[PDB]
Amino acid sequence: IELRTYVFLDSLQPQLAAYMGTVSRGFLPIPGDSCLWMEVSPGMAVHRVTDIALKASNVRLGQMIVERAFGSLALYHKDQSTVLHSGDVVLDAIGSEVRKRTKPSTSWTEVICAITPDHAVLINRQNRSGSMIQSGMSMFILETEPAGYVLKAANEAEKSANITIIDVKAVGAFGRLTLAGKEGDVEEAAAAAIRAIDQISNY
Amino acid sequence: QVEQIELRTYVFLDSLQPQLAAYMGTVSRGFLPIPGDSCLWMEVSPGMAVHRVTDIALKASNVRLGQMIVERAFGSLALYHKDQSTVLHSGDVVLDAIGSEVRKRTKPSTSWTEVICAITPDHAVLINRQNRSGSMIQSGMSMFILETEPAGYVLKAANEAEKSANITIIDVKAVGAFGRLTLAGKEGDVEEAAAAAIRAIDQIS
Amino acid sequence: QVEQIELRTYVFLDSLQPQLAAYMGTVSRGFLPIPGDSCLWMEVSPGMAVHRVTDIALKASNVRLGQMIVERAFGSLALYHKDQSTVLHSGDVVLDAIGSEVRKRTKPSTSWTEVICAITPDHAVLINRQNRSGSMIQSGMSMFILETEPAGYVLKAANEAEKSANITIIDVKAVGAFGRLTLAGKEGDVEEAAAAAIRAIDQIS
C-alpha cells in the first residue's frame, strides 16, 4: 500500500471548515479543527486504513472516497496531536512516511476578472458546495495532482486574504479550486495558493 | 373560472441586487436574471392555474419567464426584464384578465422573525447542509430570519434588506406553505438589514 | 381500525394506452405495466394504511404491485394484470375487508381546467424543466391541463383522453394533494382530448 497523497492542515479557516461541513458525508468539521487528507493505493485498502486511524485515537472520520486507482479520506479533531498520531500510525502500518507522498504539480492557474452574469449562474448551479459568486467579481481557478493538495492551497488563500470560497474539489485524480472577490484580494490570495503548493513541491 | 383564481402574492422589484440576482438564477427553472433587472413575482391557487397567468404575461410583453413552478398546492412565477415599464405592463394585462388589481392580494402575515447573535459552530454547519443554494454561513456570525405567508413576499424583504446593508444571503425560499428568508453578517450589519426587511412586509399591509 | 380507512380514489382502467403505459412504467416504483394491461388505482388515509390494502390485493390475486407509495399525508397503489377479471377480483376482496364498496369513494372535485393555445416559447421550455417524466412540449403547441382532488382520478381522464385523440402526455401526477394532468398537441386534437377528460371525471360524480 503506497502513499499517493498526504496533506495536514494546522487549522481549518472559517470558510474552509464551513465548506467541508457541507460536503462531508460523515462527521462534520469545525473552525479550528485540524484535518488530515490521505490518498493511497489500492483504493479498496482505504477501508483498512479507516479502521486503523479511528482505532488509533479520538479522531473522527468526515470523508472516505474509495476508487480502484486510489482511496482518499479526511480526519477531524480540534487537537493537532490527536490527528497527527493516527496519521503516523497508518503510515507505520503500511510501511510509509510523509515524504513518500507524490509531489504536487500545477497544470492550470489563472485569474479571470469581472465575471459575467451567465458565467456566475453556471458556476453556482453545477455542483457547487461553496458560496455564491457575483458578476463583476473576479475568480481564481487552480488544478493540481495529486488532487488532495488543493486543500492546502485553499487554507492559505483565506488565511492570507479576504476572498470567497466557491468550491473545493479534492476527490479524484485531480483537484479544483474556485475563489472570487475584488481583483486585489483574489490575486493576493491566488499567489498564496500557488506558494502553498510550492512548499510541498520542495520536499 | 378566472374569478376563482386567488392572488396570494404580487410583489414588484425595481432592481435586483447582486447577491439576490445570482441566487435567483441558481434556484430558478426559467431564464436567469441579470443584476439590476425588474421582477414581478405572483403566486396563485389552484396551484396550476399559473399557466394562464404566465401565457398572458408573455403574450402581452417582451418579458422572459424567469420562473414557473407548481407547488404541492400553490403555484408561482417570475417575470424578468431590464425595462420597468415592460414588467409592470405584463402585470397590468394579467390583472385585467383574471378580474383583479394590486390591492386584492393576500397581505403578508409574518409568522416568525428574530436575530441570533454569535451563531454556534454546530448551528452554522447545520444550516449549510440544509439544501442550501445560497452562500455559506459561519460560526460567530450573526444571522437574521424571517418566515411569512404567502411565501412569495419574502422576496421583497430580501431585496430591500440587501440594499440597506452588505449582508450574506443564505437562502430565500419564496415557494411553499411559508416563505423563509435567511441572512447573515456582522451583528450591527444584520440589525440594519433586519429593520429594512420589517418595513418591506409592513408596508404591504 | 379498518373502518377509519378512507377511500380517496378507486379507479379502474380496462386497458392502458401506449403513452400512458410507458409513462406509468417510468414514474412507478413497482412492476412496470405492459401496454394494454388493466389497472386499479387506490388512495387512502391514513397515508400508510395502504400496507393492508396492498397485502390483501396481492394475497388474493395474481396481480403485480405496480406501485406503492406513502405521500406526506396520503398513500396510493396500483395493481396491474392482463386479465381484467383478475384486477377487479383483487379490488373485490380488499373492499370486503375494509368494509366498503365502489360508491363509498371521494368523488372527483375538479379544481382547475383549461386549454391554452399557441404556448409561448418561454412557457414551453419552463414546463420541460418541471421535474418532467413524460414527453416534451413545444412552442406554438396547444396544451390542456386538468387539476383535481383526490389526485388519483386524473389517471382515468388521462387514459380516455389518449384514446380519443393522439396527443402528447406531458405529466400525469396522481399522487399528492392534487392530481395534475397535462397534455399537448394541435389545437383541434387537444380540444377532443380535453372533452374526453371532462366526461372521465364527470361520469364518476
Place this chain on the structure above:
Amino acid sequence: QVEQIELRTYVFLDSLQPQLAAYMGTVSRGFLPIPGDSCLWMEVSPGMAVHRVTDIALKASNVRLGQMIVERAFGSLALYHKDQSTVLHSGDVVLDAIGSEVRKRTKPSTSWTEVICAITPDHAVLINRQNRSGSMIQSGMSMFILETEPAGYVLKAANEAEKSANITIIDVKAVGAFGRLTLAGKEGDVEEAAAAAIRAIDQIS
C-alpha cells in the same frame, strides 16, 4: 414571540440502540450519534422557530447538534451526548426560555398501527424502493407499522421496540406531517417489538 412557539414533540432517549443509532447517523444532517448516546428530539411551529431553540441548547451545554431541519410547515432538531445529565440540561434551559415545560407538549395521536404477516414478494421489494435509508425487508418476513402525529414521537417507540426484540429497522421518519415507523423480522419477534412500541406512545398521553 417566545409564547407562540408551539412544542409539538419533546422526547428523550436514555440510550440509542445499535440499529437506531446507525440509522439516525445516515438520515441526519448534523453530527452522527454513537451507539448508546442520549438524545433529545424537539419539534416546533412556526417551522423555522427551531433556530432559537437550537442556539439555546448549544450555548447552554456541550451537546452536539445532531440534527436540524425545517419541514414545509414544522421544524425539528436532535441533541446528542454521552452524558444523560448533559442532554437533559439543554432541554431545561430551552424550556425556561420559551416559557414551557415537559407536559405542555402535543400528546401522541396514533393514526395507524398494525402487523402484516408473511409480506408478499411484491409488497416487500416495493418498500425497498421507497426512498429507504434503513435496512431491507424480505418476503415471508413479518412487518410492523406505526404512524402517528406529531411525527417526532415514533422515535421513542422505535428505540424501546428495538430494546424489546432483535428486529429490523426499515425506516423511522420523525419529520413531516406524520411520523412513520416500520420494523420487520419473524412473526413472534415482531409482535413483541410492536407491543413495546404501543406503550412508548401510550405512556406519554
Place this chain on the structure above:
Amino acid sequence: IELRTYVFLDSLQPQLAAYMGTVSRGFLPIPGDSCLWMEVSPGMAVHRVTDIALKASNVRLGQMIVERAFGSLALYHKDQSTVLHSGDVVLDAIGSEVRKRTKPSTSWTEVICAITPDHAVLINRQNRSGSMIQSGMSMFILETEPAGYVLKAANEAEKSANITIIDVKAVGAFGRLTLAGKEGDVEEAAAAAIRAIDQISNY
C-alpha cells in the same frame, strides 16, 4: 489551447431546442436560435473561453462542462451573426480556426425496430431528458467522437423527418443519440444523421 470540437447549428429545430432547454444549467435555448458547441484543451481553459465569448457580443451561455481532458460549452442567440462572431473571437484568441477541429467519426449506428415494453422503460428511466419512447416504436442509436458533433446529427434528423427526440448526450469523450418512431421515419432520419456527420468528416 487546441480546438477539439466545433459545431455550429444554423437553427435549433423545435424538439432540439426543447431538449437543450431541459438539460442546460444556464440560459435556455429557443426554437430558431443559433447554437455554438466547442470542446478544447485543457478543459480548465474553458472558463477563460467562456469569459471571452460572453465579452465579445450579446451571446448567452447555456452549458459549460469542465474536465481535464477537455472543456465544452454552448452559446445561444437568435441571430446567427452574433453567435458566429463570439466564436471567431475565441479562436482568434487561442490561435485556432474552424478546420483545426478534430474530424468526427462514427463507432456505432443501427436501427432497432419494434422495441419491447421492458426496453422502453429503461430507456425512459435511465437519465433521459427527451421524450418517451413507446413499445412497437423503432429506435435509432448513434455514437460519435468528438462527442459534440452529435448535435449536428440531431438537428438534421428532425429537420429531415418526423421522429421523436429521446436523448442527446453531447458531453464527454463520446456522444449518443436516441430517436424513435415508425421504421420509415426513423430510417430516413437515421440516414440523415449519418450524412450530416459525413459533411464534417470532409473538411
Place this chain on the structure above:
Amino acid sequence: IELRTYVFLDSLQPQLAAYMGTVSRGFLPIPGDSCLWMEVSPGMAVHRVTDIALKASNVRLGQMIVERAFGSLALYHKDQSTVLHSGDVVLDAIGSEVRKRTKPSTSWTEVICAITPDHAVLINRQNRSGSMIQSGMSMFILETEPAGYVLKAANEAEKSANITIIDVKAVGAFGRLTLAGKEGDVEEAAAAAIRAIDQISNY
C-alpha cells in the same frame, strides 16, 4: 461483438433479490428467480442484445448499463430454462459461447472486524442500496474484474452463511461487495465468496 462477462445465478437468495429489487431501474427481481448478467463490447451493442433476449422468450429486463468500453444488463424469470434460452440465443447471434467470457480475477479481499461508528455511517450514506451496518460488526470487502462476477460471490455468500448484504456494485470495469455480521459468519461467507470466484477462474 465479444463476450466480456457472463454469470448465471440459479436462484436469487432472499437478500440478493431484495437488493437488486432496489437498484434495478426496470422489471424487479424476486426471491427464487434466475438471473443472467452479461457484459459485451462495444457497449452500444447492448441495445441490440436487449432486443434479441426479450424477443427470445418471456424473460424480463431489470438492468441495462451502456458504456463505450462495454455494456451490461440483467434478465429475470422464475424458470431457469427461460432465462438460459434467451442467453444462448444472444451468444449464437453474436458468434460466442459461455467460455469465451473473460476469466474473473480478485484484486482485493479482506475482513475488517468491529467496525467503528464513524466508518459505518459513511458506509451507510455513500451510495448504499443494501442494509445498514452497525458498529462492532465485522465486514467483508471484495473487488473483481470483470465486475459482473461479484453477483456470483454474493449469491453463494448468503447461501452459505447468515450475514448482511450491505452493497453490491456490479456495473463498470470492476465490482464491489460489502457484507457484515459476527466475525464467524463473515469469514465463513467470505471464504465462500472467493471460492465461487475460483470456480469461474477454472473454465
